[PDB]
Structures are given as C-alpha cells and as structure tokens.
Amino acid sequence: LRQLKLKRFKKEVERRRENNEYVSFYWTADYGGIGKRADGTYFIRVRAKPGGWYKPEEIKEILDIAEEYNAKIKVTDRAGYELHGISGFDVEDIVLRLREKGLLTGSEGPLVRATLACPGGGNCSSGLVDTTELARIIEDNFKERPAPYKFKIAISGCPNGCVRPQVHDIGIAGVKYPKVNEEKCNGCGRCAEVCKVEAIDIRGETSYTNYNVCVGCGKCIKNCPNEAREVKEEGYLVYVGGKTGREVVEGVKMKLMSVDEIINFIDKVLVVYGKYAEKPQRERLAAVMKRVGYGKFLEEVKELMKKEIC
Amino acid sequence: LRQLKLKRFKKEVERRRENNEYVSFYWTADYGGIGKRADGTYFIRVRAKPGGWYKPEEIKEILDIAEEYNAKIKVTDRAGYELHGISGFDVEDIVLRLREKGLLTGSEGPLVRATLACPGGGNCSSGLVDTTELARIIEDNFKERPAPYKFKIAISGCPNGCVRPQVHDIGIAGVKYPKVNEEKCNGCGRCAEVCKVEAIDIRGETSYTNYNVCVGCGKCIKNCPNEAREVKEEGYLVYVGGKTGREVVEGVKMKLMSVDEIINFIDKVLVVYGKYAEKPQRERLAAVMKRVGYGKFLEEVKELMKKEI
Amino acid sequence: SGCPNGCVRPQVHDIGIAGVKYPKVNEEKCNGCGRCAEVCKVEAIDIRGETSYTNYNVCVGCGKCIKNCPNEAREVKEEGYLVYVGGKTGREVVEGVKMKLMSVDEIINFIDKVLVVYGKYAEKPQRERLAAVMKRVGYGKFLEEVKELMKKEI
Amino acid sequence: MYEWKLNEIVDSGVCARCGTCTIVCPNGILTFDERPKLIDECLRKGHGMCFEVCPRVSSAKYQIKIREKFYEKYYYAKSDIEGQDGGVVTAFLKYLLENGKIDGAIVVGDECWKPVSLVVQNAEDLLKTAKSKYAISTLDALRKAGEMGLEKVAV
Ligand code: SRM
Ligand code: SRM
Ligand SMILES: Cc1cc2nc3c(=O)[nH]c(=O)nc-3n(C[C@H](O)[C@H](O)[C@H](O)COP(=O)(O)OP(=O)(O)OC[C@H]3O[C@@H](n4cnc5c(N)ncnc54)[C@H](O)[C@@H]3O)c2cc1C
Ligand code: SF4
Ligand code: SF4
Ligand code: SF4
Ligand code: SF4
Ligand code: SF4
Ligand code: SF4
Ligand code: SF4
Ligand code: SF4
Ligand code: SF4
Ligand code: SF4
Ligand SMILES: O=S([O-])[O-]
Ligand SMILES: O=S([O-])[O-]
Ligand SMILES: [Ca+2]
Ligand SMILES: [Ca+2]
C-alpha cells in the first residue's frame, strides 16, 4: 500500500510537470541540508566530513551529480559542499543517491551542525593533539542532533585557533604549557624567538615564562635544542558559549578536559540549553547562558555530568 | 645557460634520490601555498576561488593529482583546497601543473589571504548585495599582496555574517535598513515575526523599528505583504581591525562604502599597516591599529584615500 | 586620568583622557642592570645582556621605566594626553575607542564636536548614550564628521 | 477581492483538505467545510501561521522526526466496541478519558454521513464516532476544545 500510494504520487507529480502545472515540493523538508535559493531552485548541503578530508570517490560523486544536473559546486567555510541549481523534482533523487555513497546531506536547521576540525596532530607541524579522531567521535555522538537553534563545535589542534574555538558554542583547542628545567637551560635564547605572543624572558643562563601571556603552543618545548623545556600541563582546553553571525560573543575558557569529559560536557550543555531555551531559532546557547546566568547554567551542567553513568 | 644549469640540477637531485642521499627541498619556497607537514611530507594549498565556487574542470584536476600522487584531499575553512602527502621531489611539478589549469597555489605567508565570500545576492534568499563580483574585484586587486603579516578579507551578503565580517582585517556586510510608510502599514504584525533580533514593535494600525537593535537584514521590507516598509538606507557596511586566531578582536564598524571606496579603503589600510608595523609575522592589523591609535591610524587612511581621487 | 592606571576609568567614559609617556632606550647609557623590568606592571620590558627592550604591543606608557632608570638610559619617545571616545557603563559596559594623543585645545575642540555630532544623530533622548548613537551611524561616519567640524573651528 | 497566500496551494489542487490552517487562525477569520475559506479580510493577506502550519507548503518532517525519534512496533487487535474494524481507536480513546490521560477527544462524528468534528469528554458519546467517514473531515473541534479551556486532548 505504501508503494502504491508513492507510485500514484510520482505519477501525479510527473503529470503536473508535463502539463506545466504548479507543484509545491513540500517533501524536500523530509531531508536535511535542503535550502531554497533566491531564484527558486534548491541547494543541497553535504554535511562536512570530519577535518575537511574527502575521499576521491566522495568528491567524484558530487562532480558527477553537478555535471548531470548542471548544478554549481560551492565549498562552505565549514569545509562542506553545496550543489546549487537543483530542481524540486530532482532534490529527493539526489539526496538518496548521495546517501548511498555515505554523503549525508545536513548541517542545516536547528541542530548540531558539522563539527569543524583542523588537520591538527599528525598533519600540522603546530598540532599538539589529535583533531581528526576527536571530530569523528563528536560527529558519531551528536551529528544532526536537534537543538533550540544551530549548535556549532570546533576542534583546534593548537592555540592558533584556525577553526575559531573562542567563538563556537563549544570550542576545543590543543594546549601544551611549558616549565623550565634550570639544570638543562643555558640561556641560549632560542625559545623566545619561536614564541609569537612573546611570553618568554631570557635572563643570563636561564629562561622564564609569563603565564598570563603564554597560550600553550608548546613551540618552546619542541624547539629547545637543549631539551630544557618540559611539559607542565597538556591536553584539550575547552570553551563554551561562543558565537558569531549577527553578533560576536566570546566563549568562556573552562578547563582541560579528557575526551570522555568532552563528550559528557557537550551532551550536558545541550541538555541544559534545551531545558532553558524559550525561543527556538532565535536564542543561541550564548543567549540562553546569559539570560539564566553563566554560574547557574554551568553548575547545572556539572551536576548532570556527575550523574552520568554511560 | 639557464636551462643547462636547471638540467644539471635535476640530474643531481635524481642521483641523490636514487642513492638515498639527503636532499634539502629549498626551492619549494619559490612558490606560494607550500607548507611542511609533521611527518616530513608537504601540503600544497590552492588559493580559494571567489565565493567558494569551483568549476568541474578545476576539481577534476585536484582529483587527478591526488590519485596520481596518493595524496589526501583537504578542504579549508576559507573554502580552499590542500593536497597532503606530497614529496619534496614532486612539489614543483604539481604547482606548475596546477598553475596551467588556473589553480594558483597561495593563501600562505605574510600576504593578503584568499578573500572569503558567501553566496550572497542572486544565490542566498537572505542576500542583499552581490558578493561574488566584489570578491573577484578584491582578488584581482590584492591577491597574494605582501603585508607585515597575514591579511584576511570577508564579504557577507547580509548581516548574518556567515563569513564573519566583524572578526576580519577588513569585513564587508550587505545591509538594508527599513522605514515605515504609515499610509500602507495596517499593523498586520507580519514584519515582527521575520525579525530575528526582535527590533520591531507592532502598535495598533502601525509598526515601528528600534534602530539600536535593527541590523539591516531587510527581511521586514521583503516580507511585508502590504509593501509598507521601504528602504531607508542600503549598501555595503564596512568593518576594520578585526581578527581571530590566538586571540579574538572585534573589528570597528566604519560606514557604508561604494565598491570604488572599498578598493581604495583596502589599499590605504594596507599602506598605513605597512608603514606602522614594527614586527612582521607577529603584529596583525588590529595590533598595529591599537598601538598607534584607531583615530590616528584611520585619520591617515582617510588622508591617503582623498589623495587617490 | 594622570597616567595609564585609569583610576577614573577613561576607557568606559563618553570621553576619556589618560596621561601617557612612552619610552625609548639609549643603548650608550643602558647597561642591562634590569631595574626597569621590575617597575613595569604589564611586563613589557626585556632585559638582554648589556641592553633592554620594550614590547610596544604591551607597553601602556606609564613612564615608570624612564623615571626609575638609575642610569638615565630610557628617554621619552612620545608624551601627552591619550584620548578615548564612545565608552560607557551602567546597564551595559561599552569600551571607548582609543583615538590619539591630543593637545588641550584639540581636546576642547574634540569634546565640543563629539557633542554636536551626538546631538545631530541622537533619536531617543534619555535612552541613547553617545556609544549607542556612534554604533548606529557607524564609528567611521561619526568620527569623520567630528573631524570635519574640528577643522572648520580653526 | 481578499488576498490569501494559501490560495496557490488550494487552487492548484495540491491542498490535502486537512483543515489545519483554519483552526490556527487567531482572528477566527478562516472557516473550513471541505476547503479553507476567508470570511473576513486578512491584514497579512494570508502571510501568517495558516501558511506556516500547512503540510503542503513544507512537510517539516526532518526537524520533527529527529525530535520525535519515531520507531515502529507492529501489532493487531480487536475490542468489545463495534467500530470500522476492531474498534481499537475508540477503545483507546475510552481508556484515555476514563484514566484521566486527556480532558477530551477530538473525533469525527457524522450527520447523514456528512463528517462533523466533535469534542468528546464522555465514553458514551465516543460510540457514535466509531466508524470511517470517507468524505472530507475537519479539525474544527480542536478550536472548540480551546474555547472550552480543555488542557489536554487526543486527536
Ligand atoms: C554556506 C554558508 C556560508 C558559506 O559561504 O560558507 C552559510 C550559508 C547560510 N547561512 Fe550561515 N552559512 C554558513 C556558515 C555560517 C557561520 C560560520 C560557521 O558556521 O562556521 C555563521 C556564524 C557562526 C555562528 O553562527 O556561530 C553563520 C551565520 C548565519 C546566521 C546568523 C546566526 C546567528 O545566530 O546570528 C543565519 C540566519 C539565522 O540563523 O537566523 C545563517 C543562515 C544561513 C543561510 C541558510 C541563510 C538562511 O537563513 O537560510 C545561508 C544559506 C545560503 C546558501 O546559499 O548557502 N547563517 N553561517 C556556511 C555553511 C557552512 C556549513 O556547511 O554548515
Ligand atoms: C588549513 C587551515 C585550517 C583548516 O582546517 O582550514 C589553517 C592551517 C594552518 N594555519 Fe591557520 N589555517 C587556516 C585558517 C585560519 C583561520 C581562519 C581564517 O583565516 O579564515 C585563523 C584565524 C582567523 C584569523 O587569523 O583571522 C587561523 C589562525 C592561524 C594562526 C594564528 C594567527 C594569529 O594572528 O593569531 C597561525 C600561526 C601564526 O600565524 O603565527 C596559523 C597557521 C596555520 C598553519 C600554516 C600553521 C603554520 O604556521 O604552519 C596551519 C597549516 C596546517 C595545515 O595542514 O594546513 N593559523 N588559521 C586554514 C587555511 C585556510 C586557507 O585556505 O587560508
Ligand atoms: C477516509 C479514510 C480512508 C481510509 N483508508 C484506509 C485504507 O486505505 N487502508 C486502511 O488500512 N485503512 C484505512 N482507513 C482506516 C480505517 O478505515 C479505520 O478507520 C481504522 O482501521 C481504524 O478502525 P477502528 O475500528 O480501529 O477504529 P474505530 O473504533 O472505528 O474509530 C474510528 C475513528 O476514526 C475517526 N474518523 C472517522 N472518519 C474520520 C475522518 N474522515 N477523518 C478523521 N478521523 C476520522 C473517528 O473519529 C474515530 O475516532 C481509512 C480511514 C478513513 C477515515
Ligand atoms: S589550529 Fe594549530 S594545529 Fe590546527 S591547523 Fe592551525 S596551526 Fe595547525
Ligand atoms: S631554548 Fe631551551 S636552553 Fe635555550 S634559553 Fe630557551 S629553554 Fe633555555
Ligand atoms: S608554549 Fe608557546 S606561547 Fe607559551 S612560552 Fe612556549 S612558545 Fe610561548
Ligand atoms: S551572510 Fe547572509 S547572504 Fe550570505 S550566506 Fe549568510 S544569510 Fe546568506
Ligand atoms: S508587515 Fe508591513 S503592513 Fe504588516 S505591520 Fe509590518 S510594516 Fe505594517
Ligand atoms: S531590517 Fe531586519 S533587523 Fe531590521 S527591523 Fe527589519 S527584519 Fe528586523
Ligand atoms: S633600568 Fe635603565 S640602565 Fe637598567 S636595564 Fe633598564 S633602561 Fe637599561
Ligand atoms: S612606560 Fe611603563 S608600561 Fe611601558 S615599558 Fe615602561 S614601565 Fe612598562
Ligand atoms: S495570516 Fe493569520 S489572521 Fe490571516 S488568515 Fe492566516 S492565521 Fe488568520
Ligand atoms: S493546511 Fe491543509 S487544508 Fe489548509 S491549505 Fe494546507 S493542505 Fe490545505
Ligand atoms: O547555515 S548556517 O546556519 O550555518
Ligand atoms: O594559515 S592560516 O593562517 O590561514
Ligand atoms: Ca519590541
Ligand atoms: Ca619579556
């Protein structure tokens, strides 16, 4: 019966197309990543893959669809893809075709958007932590999860914040803070040259660090020729309540968190955000945190985190 | 002689490769968009095309190179491409091959980085101004231009700032501010529903706008069923001195500017930035503007802008 | 404010004035004694061997290093009244924008012209502060007009 | 004439004739028998929540499904109540009313097989609605339930 009704529907839509009758493509909202262009046609957003890494087979499929439907190919600033100029008659066919090749259409609407990660550890020479696997874990746990409004997560491999962790709903940044071993330090002065923030002071036969300036890039540990700089503290630094768009809101620096802590934290922040949100599609996390208070909001997030058993 | 010396060089590099001798790929710095990965291999950055729009012929070339050299394909958050896992022996060949197809390697080092633009007018339903042609004009005038440090420009089609104009060295945002025609307004209340910032007040048989909240998205003009809302002011709103990275700095809202004014402004901000920068590769525009003062810095930018005309 | 410590909060006032004195090092007199780095609260100074340096991205122009150098190796690079505009406190905090050094006559002219442009563009008396009017018309457009009126005074 | 944005959906024949658009009108200027109709001038020209709730303008299934997280459990049953088939819908509504799960049931009754949307708060009145009406039905009783001040209902 489901197939007979769908066949009757397809027959009616084709009949309207052939007779130039009005068609409302209401079923396009059955899928994620669908938007309507200013000219009346549609665009299909492929949810960005973790780290912006795409297989040749994945890009080739997008290229085949673009040439077959004469659609324009757009690359998004979250490292996603958009196929522009799609007719309402072909939207569903393209989404299901993309779905077969693992290219989920999404990162649109009031939900968790595509997680933005930089090459990070193992790829970038400045990378301190792994960003590709963390992005995959976050994508597997929260991809397309509903929220009162868009929710964006960014994972940076180091404090240079290439993916902007300080202005994301939840921002993660790899950090490696130094400590000086006076027995090995000889005041050669090399570490002060690799520090972009100029947090280091070279004095006689030793060196110091201004921890109010140090961002934990770990360059001074890596580039010390005498191995006099050691790891004081290391890990993933977390930020919460960041946002961009109509207004800029800087996220609040929380603390270093383990991967399990990060997953628990992201889940709890979403629970407390959903509990206190009053205006879906208008209030971002930052607005809800500001209205109820950062202290009240974050202390509830902590209480729910302690209760977590899975 | 130039070719004989190059042939001798290629012969020596091949001999070292075959005998597993050390090679320093010093010539990779002859090109833009080159970086060294943590594992010793290289990545080649294709300067992002305006608006993130790529022709099929262009993406196919990147795909062919990736498969030929077994390189990973990365997409950047400025809508650029990066080929990862390139050997120092193949970097030069790939750059020149990409150059032939119009894919210049760049957006790397202390220079003007790839201009970031959203679909904007004609593409996005929220677009108020054209962003693709403006991005092409800015790219043609400043692409790969040297500066004391990286310089990033972003063009948004509306005030939603998808490409973050408020945290860019120079940020452009399309704006359309409303004014109410009392003869046509009947207080239907539809405009207040399309306003995300809730700047509108519906009172009896009329409506009002709080201009301290209004961001100029123009949704209330577009979606008024009675055509009671008209354009009060329209154009490209400009921001300067913004940035992200290690620290966040919000750019300062300047004023509406014409395309010719924007090009003149970008050029003069770069001239005054270069004149006052003391530490290349450390001081961003925001740091130089803060040190000399925003008033003093912008006053000079204006004086140079007047001399152009 | 008499110095950059901003005891009367120049950065959050409609118009804020702060005394500043920026340093420059005389290498012939500097011997790297290290005393200047101790009097710097912002830690903008670097003592290296027989000399010293200043990070002008950190230096706030308090002039303590010039005053407290026992060898008179630090001299005045730049000096005067640093001006801020568009700041405020109360229901919300708005930081004023750093303009430039100004002479007393320039400060009086500037205060007058900021008030004229503020009055010209204000739409809601008793609700809109200078910062709100500057934000609505744009800082560039607002300050450009203030400068044009300042030039006509002279 | 009086302009109404949903006229394109209705005149084209895409309209499902469900009657959701007319029950949401806060001015009660929309009525529904077998198709939506304006009984007064709309200041918005139909640019309002009548157009926004229409399942034929946009299904909005993706955003609703990710929140509802629907699953599928297949069963079949019959009850003592005589209905179209097993009388399961009426038996379920009777249970919800009797166990205080709902303040009223929004059901379709009939007059000469002409469907009538009704608010039922008693089980005895449920039996009169236990049968399929293949003629166009409305959701009008949901608006009546609102005017009555009912807190929870089953539809
Ligand atoms: C494609 C993209 C711009 C680009 O050139 O890359 C984009 C495109 C649109 N954005 Fe965006 N946004 C895009 C990244 C952003 C970002 C930055 C980011 O996410 O990394 C921002 C600001 C960062 C943030 O929000 O935290 C952004 C801020 C908005 C806003 C205002 C958000 C706010 O809360 O202030 C809207 C409209 C709204 O939410 O009311 C919006 C809405 C839109 C819409 C869907 C317009 C709309 O309301 O329907 C645009 C689709 C037009 C089109 O043709 O694609 N877009 N948008 C980006 C999609 C990335 C992706 O694949 O997911
Ligand atoms: C690829 C990319 C990350 C990504 O996943 O997309 C990236 C990658 C790197 N960035 Fe970046 N940055 C990238 C966009 C950004 C952005 C966002 C933007 O520009 O749109 C930021 C912050 C925004 C801004 O700067 O205004 C950013 C902030 C940095 C910083 C910190 C600079 C600062 O002023 O604080 C550095 C290091 C530095 O400059 O000292 C850096 C340096 C680097 C380097 C080259 C590290 C280095 O010094 O060699 C990274 C190369 C690793 C790699 O494998 O690509 N990257 N980087 C982005 C390249 C886009 C492009 O095509 O140009
Ligand atoms: C127009 C129509 C077409 C149908 N087509 C099919 C079909 O093709 N295949 C199929 O397997 N089943 C179909 N059904 C469902 C079937 O007719 C039965 O209604 C269903 O199996 C439940 O029967 P029951 O005995 O459990 O419910 P009952 O105990 O009989 O309760 C019936 C309920 O249906 C409601 N109702 C009756 N008419 C309408 C109406 N027009 N709109 C809304 N609610 C109404 C009544 O208010 C009542 O609450 C259709 C129903 C309708 C109304
Ligand atoms: S955030 Fe750090 S690790 Fe990541 S790409 Fe940028 S410089 Fe490299
Ligand atoms: S590079 Fe190492 S040995 Fe040299 S001054 Fe720095 S910490 Fe000391
Ligand atoms: S970790 Fe980085 S920011 Fe900190 S002192 Fe070392 S080089 Fe400087
Ligand atoms: S900035 Fe505006 S015009 Fe550009 S993609 Fe975003 S919503 Fe559309
Ligand atoms: S939508 Fe138009 S007619 Fe209706 S209240 Fe707003 S300005 Fe007035
Ligand atoms: S232009 Fe946009 S922000 Fe301004 S009142 Fe209209 S809908 Fe609101
Ligand atoms: S106190 Fe004077 S002499 Fe001593 S290091 Fe500083 S500038 Fe040089
Ligand atoms: S003037 Fe003050 S802030 Fe500047 S270097 Fe001297 S002591 Fe430090
Ligand atoms: S726009 Fe509002 S008042 Fe007009 S018919 Fe629709 S629901 Fe009723
Ligand atoms: S809500 Fe239902 S009855 Fe109204 S126009 Fe849409 S499909 Fe038709
Ligand atoms: O598409 S924007 O909402 O991320
Ligand atoms: O290389 S990053 O600065 O774009
Ligand atoms: Ca209001
Ligand atoms: Ca120092």
Q: Largest interface: which pair? A: A-B, 55 and 56 residues
Radius of gyration of chain A: 24 Å
Beta-strand percent range of chain A: 15-25%
Number of helices of chain A: 9
Oligomer: part of a larger assembly
Give me the count of strands of chain A.
12
| Estimated structural class of chain A | alpha+beta
First CA to last CA of chain A: what distance?
Answer: 41 Å
Q: How does the overall form of chain A come out from the CA principal axes?
A: elongated
Helix content of chain A: 25-40%
Widest sheet: strand ordering of chain A:
6-7-8-11-12
Q: Bound small molecules, which ones?
A: siroheme, flavin-adenine dinucleotide, iron/sulfur cluster, sulfite ion, calcium ion
Sheet with most strands of chain A: 5 strands, mixed
Q: Which sequence of SSEs, written as H and E, runs from N to C of chain A? A: HEEEHEEHEHEEHEEHEEHHH
PDB class: oxidoreductase
Keywords: Sulfite detoxification, Sulfur metabolism, sulfide, hydrogenotrophic methanogens, iron-sulfur cluster, sulfite-reductase evolution, sulfite/nitrite reductase, siroheme, flavin, oxidoreductase, ferredoxin, F420, hyperthermophile
Entry title: Crystal structure of the Coenzyme F420-dependent sulfite reductase from Methanocaldococcus jannaschii at 2.3-A resolution
Chains A, B, C, D: Coenzyme F420-dependent sulfite reductase
